[PDB]
């Protein structure tokens, strides 16, 4: 829970820079294994426009759209593509609660006011807490944007999940 307050404060801090609204997420046994959760190093995220392929590259296209020419020396664009890809990802805040809990009950153990329309008793074996930030370019946001999610472990492997931002905002954004 503790990253949510800090990430809300930090995305309020940097909102003049990138215009990213924060997005607090929790994940359970339905996505990752406990062995994957007990030693998960960090999480990455990148907001991709429906037409713009990143936010770290140039907005009006990029010079990496020319195809890879099967070259020995510079394999795929050289190292410039590599540190452009290191620029296109961003780190998020991150905590792991390995012992099982229920976020209704657990968020009642912390001092919050859990005010839900109905108490669907959802149980999970291990709760990993994070908060990403999806980038509205101006104040206006498009629903067809997508948000990617890397999960990186100390061996160097990663798991890649992405989803388009309208599915996060089907009934939330139409409520306003």
């Amino acid at each position: 829970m503790e990253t949510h307050l800090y990430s809300d404060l930090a995305f309020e801090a940097r909102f003049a820079d990138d215009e990213q609204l924060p997005l607090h997420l929790v994940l359970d046994q339905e996505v990752l294994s406990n062995e994957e959760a007990e030693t998960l190093r960090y999480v990455y995220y990148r907001n991709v426009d429906s037409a713009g392929r990143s936010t770290g590259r140039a907005p009006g296209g990029d010079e990496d759209d020319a195809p890879a020419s099967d070259d020995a020396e510079d394999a795929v664009g050289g190292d410039r593509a590599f540190d452009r890809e290191r620029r296109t990802w961003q780190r998020a805040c991150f905590r792991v609660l390995p012992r099982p809990l229920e976020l209704l009950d657990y968020l009642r153990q912390s001092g919050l006011t859990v005010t839900l329309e109905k108490e669907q008793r959802v149980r999970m074996f291990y709760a990993v807490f994070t908060t990403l930030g999806l980038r509205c370019p101006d104040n206006r946001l498009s629903g067809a944007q997508t948000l990617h999610l890397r999960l990186v472990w100390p061996d160097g492997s990663y798991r890649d999940w992405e989803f388009l931002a309208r599915d996060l905002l089907r009934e939330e954004m139409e409520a306003n």
């Binding site: 607090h24 929790v26 359970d28 339905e30 005010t115 989803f163 996060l168 939330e172």
Partner: peptide
Amino acid sequence: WKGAGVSRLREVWDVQHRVRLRVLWY
């Protein structure tokens, strides 16, 4: 912020329907 709490909490999916995770709305 503590006394504010959460409006609502719901699950979402990925594109390929492999991952379900829950969003929190303070």
